[PDB]
Amino acid sequence: GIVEQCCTSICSLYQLENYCN
Amino acid sequence: GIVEQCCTSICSLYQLENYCN
Amino acid sequence: FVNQHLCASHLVEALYLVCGERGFFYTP
Amino acid sequence: FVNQHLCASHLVEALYLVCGERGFFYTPKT
């Protein structure tokens, strides 16, 4: 999820944005 | 994230692909 | 009527297919 | 160099920003 993609690893804006809704 | 997006709701290929890595 | 939702094992299987050798993280 | 990992409160604050009026589900465990 968001913690693995953006915290453990480094995410792009679009990856982060894929979490909205 | 992926469940709300693809399971509760319906997701597109690029949404699914954005969870890879 | 036909179901477009991807849940549980069907979701993991969909990630296994689209991600291919990139791999993926998953937690239920 | 800025630390590029987004964690904890910084991560929630980033979602708040980029999602805007769409809003978001924050679900840290999965």
Swiss-Prot record, chains A, B:
Cystine residue pairs: 6-11
The name this protein goes by in its record: Insulin A chain
Domain of life: Eukaryota
